[PDB]
């Protein structure tokens, strides 16, 4: 996995690649690593895939109830606090490494969370197996006072570094832009630079190729 | 980590590097290890980032609840709450914490809490992996009742050497000044402190 987060003028942007692996095998070539906690608070997850999905949904559920209870839009620090105290309780056995980002009445925010429950603040962050490739790009091209279009470019470039150089990362680039005063825009498959080339041959078999012993109609009705 | 806290004439100053380590990879080069648990009671964190964060948050909660009932807590009280957490959970924690605060009666105070969860009140304290390299320097150069400017220089020079020799320490030197005047934050960049 390669995931990044970048702060800009009037908000924050996060991005991720779309490869999921079991061992050296690519299980899913276009999975979604960008999760919604609340409408304007989004999460990028690396590590154990089930843990990142489960922990983001649980906190996302509790954040919704909290928002309804308090009649207030949810804050990023609340999601951060709930996630870290949950992860810390399980002593790293829940293998969720997250980049949390969003906007709220307080402003725009960007955090990372490690499996053991430690959090970090930053203007630019990267997690996952391709984080070193991504961070190299971020450390080279990041500056203060980035525009929206500059931050998206920087973020996706950082993901691309992971896609090309890290074997754990690949396929496409997903992006989500959270700007203050506006709706968050989720850009699924923002870049698709790994399209499969046309095959040399069609492997459509002549009908009857497969030997058959028995046929029977299956009853699905009541 | 490299961390320290030093008492002086007007109060106490906390100091720290900004390096967080996952192996030999620097996970965060701009970390803030100086942490508020009360208005004028702060702490320096070393060891496990997760453990020290979880402890600091619990202490902050305890002191906020203390303040609601009994008013401002003493620096000794804050150190006691840290100790209780570090001592009773010694088997599951890797946390080396220095507690520093300013009272008006007691002035500047420093308490260090090592791995075991023991408490030691000192004029100044050093901790973290990088502290090993400056025991000689700090012992020879520390004086009681220093001025603000002298104490800042003492911490700056000390952490500069700790950073120079310790691979696990680096980045910027953060400081927090605690006096009657209020709370002042200071930062010092490589280009300054490296060529000291």
């Amino acid at each position: 996995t390669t995931i990044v987060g970048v702060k800009f003028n009037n908000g924050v942007v996060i991005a991720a690649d779309t490869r999921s692996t079991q061992g050296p095998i690519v299980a899913d070539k276009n999975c979604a690593k960008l999760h919604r906690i609340s409408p304007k608070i989004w999460c990028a997850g690396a590590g154990t895939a089930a843990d990142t999905e489960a922990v983001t949904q649980l906190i996302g559920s509790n954040i919704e109830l909290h928002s309804l209870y308090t009649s207030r839009e949810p804050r990023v620090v609340s999601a951060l606090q709930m996630l870290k105290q949950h992860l810390f309780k399980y002593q790293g056995h829940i293998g969720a490494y997250l980049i949390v980002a969003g906007v709220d009445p307080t402003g725009s925010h960007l955090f990372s969370i490690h499996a053991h429950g430690s959090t970090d603040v930053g203007y630019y962050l990267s997690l996952g197996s391709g984080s070193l490739a991504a961070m190299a790009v971020l450390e080279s091209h990041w500056k203060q006072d980035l525009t929206k279009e500059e931050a998206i470019k920087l973020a996706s470039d950082a993901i691309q570094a992971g896609i090309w150089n890290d074997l754990g990362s690949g396929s496409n680039v997903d992006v989500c832009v959270m700007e203050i005063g506006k709706d968050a825009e989720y850009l699924r498959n923002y870049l698709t630079p790994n399209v499969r080339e046309e095959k040399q041959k069609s492997y459509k078999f002549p009908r009857g190729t497969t030997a058959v012993l028995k046929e029977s109609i299956v009853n699905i009705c009541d | 980590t490299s961390i320290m806290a030093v008492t002086f004439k007007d109060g106490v100053i906390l100091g720290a590097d900004s390096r967080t380590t996952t192996g030999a990879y620097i996970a965060n080069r701009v970390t803030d290890k100086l942490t508020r648990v009360h208005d004028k009671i702060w702490c320096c964190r070393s060891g496990s980032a997760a453990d020290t964060q979880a402890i600091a948050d619990i202490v902050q909660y305890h002191l906020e609840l203390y303040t609601s009932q009994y008013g401002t807590p003493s620096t000794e009280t804050a150190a006691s709450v840290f100790k209780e957490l570090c001592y009773e959970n010694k088997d599951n924690l890797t946390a080396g914490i220095i507690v520093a605060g300013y009272d008006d009666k007691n002035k500047g105070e420093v308490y260090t809490i090592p791995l075991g969860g023991s408490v030691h009140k000192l004029p100044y304290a050093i901790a973290g992996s990088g502290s090993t390299f400056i025991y000689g320097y700090c012992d020879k150069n520390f004086r009681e009742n220093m001025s603000k400017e002298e104490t800042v220089d003492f911490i700056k020079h000390s952490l500069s050497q700790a950073i120079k020799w310790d691979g696990s320490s680096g980045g910027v030197i953060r400081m927090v000044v605690l006096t009657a005047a209020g709370v002042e934050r200071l930062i010092f960049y490589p280009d300054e402190y490296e060529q000291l």
Binding site: - | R19, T20, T22, K33, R45, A49
Partner: peptide, 4 residues
């Protein structure tokens, strides 16, 4: 895990 992250150390300080």
């Amino acid at each position: 895990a992250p150390l300080x």
